[PDB]
Symmetry: C2
Subunit: 170 residues, 2 copies
Amino acid sequence: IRMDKKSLYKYLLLRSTGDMHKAKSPTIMTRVTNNVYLGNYKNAMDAPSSEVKFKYVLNLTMDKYTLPNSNINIIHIPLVDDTTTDISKYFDDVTAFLSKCDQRNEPVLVHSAAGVNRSGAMILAYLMSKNKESLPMLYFLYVYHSMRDLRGAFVENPSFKRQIIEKYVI
Amino acid sequence: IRMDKKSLYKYLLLRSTGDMHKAKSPTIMTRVTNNVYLGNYKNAMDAPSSEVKFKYVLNLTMDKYTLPNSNINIIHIPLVDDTTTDISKYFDDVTAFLSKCDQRNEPVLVHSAAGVNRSGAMILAYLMSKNKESLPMLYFLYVYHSMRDLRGAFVENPSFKRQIIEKYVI
C-alpha cells in the first residue's frame, strides 16, 4: 500500500509551502536502503548487539570512539554540525563507499550525535547520488520530506541543505 | 537590483524544505500587479482615502459592508476561511475579473479579514492564471514564497493551498 500518481506531487508541494511538523528528535535506527542505516549516537553504541550484522559504522561526530568488544569497522569522518563547515568535500567518497556497501550487502550504520544533520546530510547525498531516473529537484523534495516524515527531523541544518542542493540539483 | 539565474532556484528549494519564518500578520496593503492590491479588513476601511484611485474592492469576508461616502464599487464574494470551503469554484471568474481590471487600469483591492487566506488564495490564483511562461510547479513555489516573504503570511490555510495546486499545477 503506497501512494503513486500525483498524490506524491500534491504531498510534495504542500510540504514545500509550509505543511511541516515541528522537528522531532529521531530515536530508533532507520533502514534507508538494503544495507545502509541512519542513526544517532545511542544507536551506534547499540550497534554491536542489534538485529543487524554491521560490518561498518560511519562515525560523523568529532570524537573517535571504539567498540572494542566488537568486530565492526569504525570509519571516522569528523565533522561539526555548524552553519559554516563544508561537508560537500566528502560527498563523492562517502556515497561511493555506501554504494559499495549496498553492492556487497555489507551493512553500514551512518550516524552523528543527533542522527539528524551530519548523518542525514550524507544519507541524503547517497540517495541523490543513486537517482538516475527522476528530475533532481523533485527527487530532492520527495527524499527530504519522506525522510523527515519518517525520522521526525532530517537535515535541519540550512547550510547542509544548501550544499546538497548545489551538489546535486544546481 | 534583483536575483536571477539559479539563486531563485536555491532560494526556492531551501524555502521548500523548511527555511520559513513563522507567520507574521500582514499590516499594509501590497501592490501585487499594476492595478491589483492585496489587503486585510482595515486596509479596506482605509480604501476610500488612500493614495490609490480604487474603482473596485473585492470583499471576501462574510459580512456585506458599505463605504457610502465613496464611489468604490464593492464586489462581495462571501467565503469562510476554513479547511472545508471550496474556493476553487470562483477561481475562473475572479481571475478573469482581476485581469480585466489590469487591462483597464482599474485599481482593485482584494481583501479578507486577515489579508492572508481567502484574499491571498485569490491573489495566488490570479498570478498562476496569468503565467504562460514558467513551469507551474516552480512558478507556484516562487509566487508562494516571494509573496509570503513580502506579506509575512500568505495562504497559510492548507486546504486553500491544496485547491490552488489542484487547479493550476495538477
